[PDB]
Amino acid sequence: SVGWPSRLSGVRLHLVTGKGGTGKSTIAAALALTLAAGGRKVLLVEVEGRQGIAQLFDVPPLPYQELKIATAERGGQVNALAIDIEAAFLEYLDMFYNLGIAGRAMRRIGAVEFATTIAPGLRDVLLTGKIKETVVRLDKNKLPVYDAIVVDAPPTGRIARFLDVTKAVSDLAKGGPVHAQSEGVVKLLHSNQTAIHLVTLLEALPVQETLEAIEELAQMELPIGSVIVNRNIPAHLEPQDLAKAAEGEVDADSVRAGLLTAGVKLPDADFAGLLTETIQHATRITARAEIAQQLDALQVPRLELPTVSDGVDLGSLYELSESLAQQGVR
Amino acid sequence: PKTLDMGAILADTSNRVVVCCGAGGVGKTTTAAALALRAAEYGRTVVVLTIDPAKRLAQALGINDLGNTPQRVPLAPEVPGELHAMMLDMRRTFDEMVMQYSGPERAQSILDNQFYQTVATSLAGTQEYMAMEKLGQLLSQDRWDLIVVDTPPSRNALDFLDAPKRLGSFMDSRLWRLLLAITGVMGLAMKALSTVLGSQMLADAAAFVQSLDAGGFREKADRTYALLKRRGTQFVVVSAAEPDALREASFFVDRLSQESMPLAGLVFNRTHPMLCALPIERAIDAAETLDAETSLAAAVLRIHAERGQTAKREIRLLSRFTGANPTVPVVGVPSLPFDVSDLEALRALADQLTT
């Protein structure tokens, strides 16, 4: 029944997936804010070069550096890392093969863009490898630099392949240092230090993809965290009144009586119109509940976030973080 | 404002191609299908090129199969025209393109190439490029007086117009032959790729360059884009009553204007028109008096007030688009109280679109 079991508080790596447009970026930032509260330091990571963090915080494009982007409750801190795949490839060539010179020459002729584009496995090795480096990084006192890492991850249709370290490494050169580092990446991803959260909307396709992703991830023995149901709406009607209204039955006599009590007398065209407005609302709720029922089969914790009435601004991220905190996210 | 007359555009046979554009998740596929079904009801011989219909809609159109070719949608005998439909198969369209230019013999090698199968066919912009290629294939066969074009989903509505050319220029890069199929800079880059990438992958990539043997891809994307400039082409921009979708619609409208491309108008989909004239302030207060004192009446007032607030947001969003684009014809489509996944729901949607 809880949306956040205690085990999830021990997790250092949070991966936020879900279908496009369900709220991965918004919720990964709200999750980062929640985990940073109480003088903690959390890293918010994006991996597709889309600059979604900068767009969310309404700031210019972020460079390839970990930078403070938000102050969490009671002295907490959220740092941002927009991974630059081109700069990550040069970092890799220089650190693992001492080809920093070759790398710098490739950048001047657009060859790094090419190599990362023509080899999707190399791309995923660079990205998951950098994610692992942020997770295991220690300070001067052998203590973790970050309390948690939150990844605004690829969508539900790409998440299983993105975390498939064995398939990504298969198209890379045999031997060297990469094949040794990949073992540590696999170990981290499959441990109790990781959790994959799946953002969904109460719509057919986001729910279907959530189910299909959980199945693919369970087969890979990858740890599932929570299902996060975004943009919930108020029912406004009691279960019995809703079930009837979804069929076209709203007793008007009771409605007309309750309107007279509040000092409201409506004409026949406005009263009939008011009734079909509630039938249509109840038809929308019923259909959403029918879609939501498909998730009941999963023995996975579920979290719920409301709809922010206007556009998602900085203040909206704090309201969603507060909504997560009230549900036990810590 | 100004009212978009989709019915008159559909009935006029000088309109040969109707392109349904916008961001993803706004109603492009269903609008495309509803428009095509309508044209057929008007007596036209129409083909709908769908991208991603939901399973139940695809089944209702009889296009749930693996085909990449139009099929006849059986309709009531009274229907004077003909509806034909298909769902784009992105990978199969790439195969058709490869064979058209390489020939069926050389195509056997390219189709069997592991780099082609796993990398080349899934590059960014393939969905838009293959939609354009299929549109080109439909036009060349002259099997229909009207072609309704659905466009792939994206957060960026302009990807339909820009992604094929972008993919084309990437495919024509000097880097393919030079780095896979010597120099100081190219030699350094070649060494780096040999050191990092798998020998098997590099062999399949170089084999693909040798096998394909193409500025071929950009020239193809350019000629196919010129088909959208032919007389009888109409663009329909679709948007949900959301700020992101409207901003994408506005970006698309600007581009059509800059390029002198004919824009039919905007489909402002999923609206919540008020069926009760009672003001919002009065509705909340009437519900609040009942709260202090039968839970049915107050909840009914809370539905109406919430819809009214939703209707207010929709009106101010539209007035922002209309203020910036006063020349753009518009049609408001209400959110229907059922899923648009059968021929009867498409008919009800077409009624909203053509009123």
Ligand SMILES: Nc1ncnc2c1ncn2[C@@H]1O[C@H](COP(=O)(O)OP(=O)(O)O)[C@@H](O)[C@H]1O
């Ligand atoms: N709880 C919410 N209430 C209202 N709007 C939301 C909410 N969560 C996300 N959004 C909006 O929905 C859209 C899609 O969200 P986003 O975080 O960008 O999703 P994703 O990264 O999965 O594509 C954005 O316009 C965003 O501001």
Ligand SMILES: Nc1ncnc2c1ncn2[C@@H]1O[C@H](COP(=O)(O)OP(=O)(O)O)[C@@H](O)[C@H]1O
């Ligand atoms: N006016 C409408 N009223 C109700 N449902 C609608 C309406 N227009 C579209 N839908 C629904 O919205 C969803 C998305 O529509 P779809 O045409 O596939 O969008 P797109 O191609 O833009 O992603 C579908 O499930 C469809 O049935």
Ligand SMILES: [Ca+2]
């Ligand atoms: Ca006829």
Ligand SMILES: [Ca+2]
């Ligand atoms: Ca193009």
Ligand SMILES: [Mg+2]
């Ligand atoms: Mg995002």
Ligand SMILES: [Mg+2]
């Ligand atoms: Mg679609």
